[PDB]
From a paper:
To determine structures of 30S initiation complexes formed in the presence of Ksg, we incubated purified 30S subunits, IF1, IF2, IF3, fMet-tRNAfMet and MF-mRNA (Met-Phe-mRNA) with Ksg and analysed the resulting Ksg-30S complexes using single particle cryo-EM. In silico sorting revealed one major population (359,652 particles, 76%) comprising 30S subunits with mRNA, IF1 and IF3, as well as a second minor population (61,790 particles, 13%) with the additional presence of initiator tRNA. In the Ksg-30S structure without initiator tRNA, the body of the 30S subunit is well-defined, with highly-resolved density for IF1 and IF3. By contrast, the head of the 30S subunit is highly mobile, as evident from the poor quality of the density and low local resolution of the head. We do not observe any additional binding sites for Ksg, suggesting that the secondary binding site observed previously may be specific for T. thermophilus. Indeed, we observe density for the Shine-Dalgarno (SD)-antiSD helix that forms between the mRNA and the 3’ end of the 16S rRNA, as well as additional density for the mRNA extending into A-, P- and E-sites, which is lost at higher resolution, presumably due to its flexibility. Based on this comparison, it appears that the +1 and +3 positions (the A and G of the AUG start codon, respectively) would be stacked on A790 and C1400, respectively, whereas the -1 and -3 positions (E-site codon) appear to stack on G926 and G693, respectively.
During bacterial translation initiation, the 30S ribosomal subunit, initiation factors, and initiator tRNA define the reading frame of the mRNA. The first step during bacterial translation initiation is the formation of a 30S pre-initiation complex (30S-PIC), which comprises the 30S ribosomal subunit, mRNA, initiator tRNA and all three initiation factors. Upon correct decoding of the start codon by the initiator tRNA, the 30S head shifts from an open to a closed conformation, and the 30S-PIC transitions to a 30S initiation complex (30S-IC). The structures reveal that all three antibiotics bind within the E-site of the 30S and preclude 30S initiation complex formation.
Author numbering:
A (entry chain J): 76 to 177
B (entry chain U): 2 to 66
C (entry chain R): 21 to 72
D (entry chain F): 2 to 101
E (entry chain K): 13 to 119, 130 to 139
F (entry chain O): 2 to 89
The structure:
RNA sequence: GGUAUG
RNA sequence: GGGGUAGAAUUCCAGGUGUAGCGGUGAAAUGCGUAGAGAUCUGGAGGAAUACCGGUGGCGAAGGCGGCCCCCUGGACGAAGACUGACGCUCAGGUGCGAAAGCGUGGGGAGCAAACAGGAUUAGAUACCCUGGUAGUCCACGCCGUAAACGAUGUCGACUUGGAGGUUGUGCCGGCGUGGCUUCCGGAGCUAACGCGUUAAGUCGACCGCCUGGGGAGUACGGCCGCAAGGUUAAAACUCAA
């Protein structure tokens, strides 16, 4: 009968979901700031943050311009998140850095 | 709708009576339109549309004959 | 048309008590309005049912 | 001004009706008022219950009268707790013919 | 128990669920059975079939009261309107009266906003 | 509106007959009565805007009739505005 | 149940 | 405009019965429930709104106006007369009325619901969906003065083939007329066309309001109004070749 409150006591600690924010090589400053405010909000709630960077076409041939962005995000989210994964290579046409709450 | 079951009449017949009783009283049609709020402009809009459609019948059920 | 004349009024209500449209009963518009007021006065005095 | 006062009475106090009638109809004639009709229909079945009651005692008074006396009749009906329900209509003319 | 003999089957047929309460003629509850208690979950509750099953489980909860005649008081627009009644007949109870008792509000209260779905 | 009696008084008092309903004097008198009566109504019923529009048509229609009479015959005008107790 | 992008 | 009143429904409260779900969605979960919910019955409290009738029906200057009853009150129309004797039409400025939201003070608060909280959905979802929920929605008084406030069509008058309806009078012998309002179709004519078409966007006359490429802009400045929100009057530079 009293499973009702047991189920509640289970649910009262949240399951960590993974929120995805997707950048591009040429994401401009103001738009970057919006996405960063998104990530700050996600990590302060205790959610993981699968940050992706999608290359398109011949932007593939300038990988480091992308890598710069992911490095920038890591640095900005340094006193808040910890890098659970950093991309070495372009897998497909993407580079996935998982952050996670401290 | 107060379909009281009469003497020596089967259940299925009495249930058809209960349907025709409700379907004419229009109880289910009433409940549907009271499920959500329709602001007066929307009510009037539909009422005019129904009238134009009803009119468009009379000048096409005739107007052809 | 009389609110007290329940026998006449009973011809213009349904089983459930609702007033019958003039499109159905073929009543003239002036009388349908008199009839409606009659039925509504009857209902207040409890000479006709509102419902059921 | 050609009214038509119906009123229903709590069917226990059907005893009180012919006395109550007089008290009202006296106040009408007290100020010049005709009584073109008075039809006690008596005890009838209410088409729905009114404060428990399943029957009540109806009375119909077609009355020419001034306005002030009709106003006083309304205050009486309000306080007289034997009277469950009242309706003061207006009519255009006097009605003397019998109603069902 | 008191062998009720004649009782009342109130069918609350909403769009989502179907409650079936069997009461005495004075409207005291004997036993009840919802479509959501009959295994069906989510929008399988809101089926004619789940109403059929809910009736049957209610029928088998008022076995002890040995009812024979029933008054059926259907209320609401749900799929489990007729389905519930057909089940009560086949369950053995004789149906004396079937009445729609769906509330209409003679105007009254402002309904919730339309779903923009 | 005025009662049939209240009307027929005013028609007799200001007319040159009981046929004489048309006269400007009668017309102004009738309007002045009904205007005066309604001052009661609008003290109580201050938000009866729809009725007040009817009142202003009476005030307006009177002003016009008076201005007609003032230029048609000044003697008749002066008497009438004292009989009815009108400023102008 | 949202038919993101050939 | 005022006052009264009725039935239905929703919520809440108190009981009775009853027992494990209810609720909700595309699917869920939040929520509610063993301190007994939901369902059902009885009684009470309270607020708001008036099913059917109900109609391209009616009334109103427009905004708008829908239970019933009374009270106070405005306008419209017809029938015959009788009366006044051009007393008329229009109207810058002016004055008033003016949906909703909003504002002030004080009431009220069922339902609903901006904001908001939570649950979801999603790449994200500051939304749509779900559970809640405050202002507000209601009343009084005062303010505000705006809306696709629309017929996107100023007011008044006259004239100009028809058809089918609706509604409300009335005359005459179901028929035959004759007024008011109104829906639809269409002729001439008009119109860029769409369409309008005796309720004109036709043919004319009176008076008023308004327009003069797009954007900038119904913005700035100034004035007036407003407690405020703002409203009203209302530019220009510039840029485009639409
Ligand atoms: C269902 C989505 O519909 C609309 O977006 C559509 C987009 O999803 C594609 O189907 C095409 O680009 C269409 O041309 C777009 O209109 C747009 N209103 C956003 C909606 N999506 C969501 N609200 C959502 O995914 O969530
Ligand atoms: K009383
Ligand atoms: K002037
Ligand atoms: K609230
Ligand atoms: K063409
Ligand atoms: K320019
Ligand atoms: K200004
Ligand atoms: Mg009109
Ligand atoms: Mg009137
Ligand atoms: Mg308001
Ligand atoms: Mg306020
Ligand atoms: Mg809500
Ligand atoms: Mg909501
Ligand atoms: Mg404007
Ligand atoms: Mg319109
Ligand atoms: Mg305009
Ligand atoms: Mg004018
Ligand atoms: Mg046309
Ligand atoms: Mg033109
Ligand atoms: Mg401005």
């Amino acid at each position: 009968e009293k499973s009702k409150s047991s189920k509640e006591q289970k649910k009262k600690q949240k399951v960590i979901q993974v929120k995805e924010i997707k950048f591009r090589p040429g994401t401009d400053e103001g738009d970057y700031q919006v996405k960063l405010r998104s990530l700050i909000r996600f990590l302060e709630e205790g959610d993981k943050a699968k940050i992706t960077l999608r290359f398109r076409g011949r932007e593939m041939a300038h990988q480091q311009i992308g890598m710069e962005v992911l490095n920038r995000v890591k640095d900005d989210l340094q006193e808040l998140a910890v890098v659970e994964s950093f991309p070495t290579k372009i897998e497909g046409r993407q580079m996935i850095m998982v952050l996670a709450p401290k | 709708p107060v379909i009281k079951v009469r003497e020596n009449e089967p259940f299925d017949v009495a249930l058809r009576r209960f349907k025709r009783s409700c379907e004419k009283a229009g109880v289910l049609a009433e409940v549907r339109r009271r499920e959500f709020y329709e602001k007066p402009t929307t009510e009037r809009k539909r009422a005019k549309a129904s009238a134009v459609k009803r009119h468009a019948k009379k000048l096409a059920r005739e107007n052809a004959r | 048309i009389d609110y007290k004349d329940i026998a006449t009024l009973k011809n213009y209500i349904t089983e459930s008590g609702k007033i019958v449209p003039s499109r159905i009963t073929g009543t003239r518009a002036k009388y349908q309005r008199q009839l409606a007021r009659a039925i509504k006065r009857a209902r207040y005095l409890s000479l006709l049912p509102y419902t059921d | 001004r050609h009214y038509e006062i119906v009123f229903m009475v709590h069917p226990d106090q059907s005893e009180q009706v012919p006395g109550m009638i007089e008290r009202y109809t006296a106040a009408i004639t007290g100020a010049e008022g005709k009584i073109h009709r008075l039809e006690d229909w008596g005890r009838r079945q209410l088409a729905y219950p009114i404060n428990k009651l399943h029957k009540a005692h109806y009375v119909l008074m077609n009355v020419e009268a001034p306005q002030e006396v009709i106003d006083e009749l309304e205050t009486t009906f309000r306080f007289n707790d034997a009277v469950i329900r009242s309706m003061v209509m207006r009519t255009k003319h006097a009605v003397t013919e019998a109603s069902p | 128990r008191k062998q009720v003999s004649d009782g009342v089957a109130h069918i609350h047929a909403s769009f989502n669920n179907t409650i079936v309460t069997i009461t005495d003629r004075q409207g005291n509850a004997l036993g009840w059975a919802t479509a959501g208690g009959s295994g069906f979950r989510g929008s399988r509750k809101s089926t004619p079939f789940a109403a059929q099953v809910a009736a049957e489980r209610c029928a088998d909860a008022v076995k002890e009261y040995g009812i024979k005649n029933l008054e059926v008081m259907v209320k609401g627009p749900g799929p489990g309107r007729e389905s519930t009644i057909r089940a009560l007949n086949a369950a053995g109870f004789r149906i004396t009266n079937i009445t729609d008792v769906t509330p209409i509000p003679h105007x009254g209260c402002r309904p919730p906003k339309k779903r923009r779905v | 509106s005025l009662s049939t009696e209240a009307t027929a008084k005013i028609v007799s008092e200001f007319g040159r007959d009981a046929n004489d309903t048309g006269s400007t004097e009668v017309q102004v008198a009738l309007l002045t009565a009904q205007i005066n009566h309604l001052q009661g109504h609008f003290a109580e019923h201050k938000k009866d805007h729809h009725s007040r529009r009817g009142l202003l048509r009476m005030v307006s229609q009177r002003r016009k009739l008076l201005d007609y009479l003032k230029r048609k015959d000044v003697a008749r005008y002066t008497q009438l505005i004292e009989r009815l107790g009108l400023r102008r």
